[PDB]
């Protein structure tokens, strides 16, 4: 989907835009023999706030075989905590420190 | 005559005794030690203090070895290509000076 | 003797360069322990014999 | 009886993982889990492949 500058500057207030944003972290390296780019890819639109609020994990691949890719995201520990029921039956995370 | 013979009589005498003349594989066939500091094959060190003997150095056959290898095909198909650009004027070319 | 020469020669000209073939990575529990001690994570599906 | 509830097996949640894949990445080695471990861990491994 594409958004020309005009439409961002003139769209009705209260309408909901649907922007797209590349996570280009999974772009593999270019060949050593790929022709040079004389030009320059450019970008205009950016968010004012974090956008990856729903994001649990990122870049499930190895950099090398053992290194983590920069910007890779592990799942939060809380997603796995499955603690207990409370004395009254509410869900609880496991105690952090033993006490 | 049995110079090539690694093993012999792979059967049990009784169930537990070895048949007379039965031949176990030499330990060296299984040693798969290491690469040397420079990459030559080496048997494992015998005693803990001594260095591992190069496999090529002795007359044993070792059927397990470390082999260095590329993880995937080197021919990726991204062959090098160049922009040749010819002289503008043949008469202007400077043959001179080496 | 000619055989030996042609063997020597054929070795002298072996320009083979190994690339990793298909390889399995057994879970440790799937293997008998004696095999698992020898195995090092992955191994070629065409294990030779030893 | 009044049908106060909605008895159901294998409940679905309010939240679920969604996942986008770049299909060009694939590990060369083929992991071989036991059939049981694949019965448990399978749908997870398949999704966060």
């Amino acid at each position: 989907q594409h958004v020309d500058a005009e439409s961002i500057m003139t769209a009705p207030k209260g309408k909901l835009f649907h922007l797209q944003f590349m996570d280009g972290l999974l772009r593999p390296e270019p060949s050593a023999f790929d022709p040079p780019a004389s030009g320059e890819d450019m970008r205009l639109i950016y968010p004012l706030q974090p956008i990856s609020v729903a994001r649990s994990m990122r870049a499930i691949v190895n950099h090398n075989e053992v290194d983590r890719p920069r910007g890779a995201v592990a799942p939060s520990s809380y997603e796995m905590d499955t603690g207990t029921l409370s004395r009254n039956g509410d869900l609880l995370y496991s105690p952090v420190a033993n006490g | 005559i049995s110079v090539a013979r690694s093993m012999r009589a792979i059967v049990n005498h009784n169930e537990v005794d070895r048949p007379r003349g039965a031949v176990a594989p030499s330990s060296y066939e299984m040693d798969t030690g290491t690469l040397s500091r420079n990459g030559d094959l080496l048997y494992s060190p015998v005693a803990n203090g001594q260095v591992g003997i190069p496999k090529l150095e002795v007359d044993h056959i070792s059927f397990s070895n470390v082999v260095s290898m590329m993880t995937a095909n080197i021919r990726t198909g991204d062959d090098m290509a160049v922009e040749r650009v010819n002289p503008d004027d043949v008469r202007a070319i400077n043959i001179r000076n080496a | 003797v000619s055989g030996l020469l042609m063997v020597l020669f054929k070795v002298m000209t072996d320009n083979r360069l190994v690339i990793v073939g298909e390889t399995t990575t057994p879970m440790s529990n799937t293997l008998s322990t004696v095999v698992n001690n020898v195995l090092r994570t992955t191994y070629h599906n065409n294990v030779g014999v030893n | 009886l009044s049908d106060d509830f909605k008895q159901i097996s294998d409940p679905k949640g309010y939240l679920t993982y969604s996942v986008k894949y770049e299909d060009q990445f694939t590990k060369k080695d083929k992991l071989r889990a036991s059939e049981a471990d694949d019965r448990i861990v399978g749908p997870t491994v398949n999704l966060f492949k």
Binding site: E29, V61, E65 | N73, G77 | I19, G21 | Q24, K27
Partner: peptide, 26 residues
């Protein structure tokens, strides 16, 4: 039945390297 003998020898499989287009690491 007659007693018999038979041989074997380990097979070759040395194929030319496969040309994959997938890649393991970023």
């Amino acid at each position: 039945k007659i007693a018999t003998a038979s041989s074997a020898r380990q097979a070759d499989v040395e194929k030319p390297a496969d040309v994959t287009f997938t890649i393991e690491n970023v």
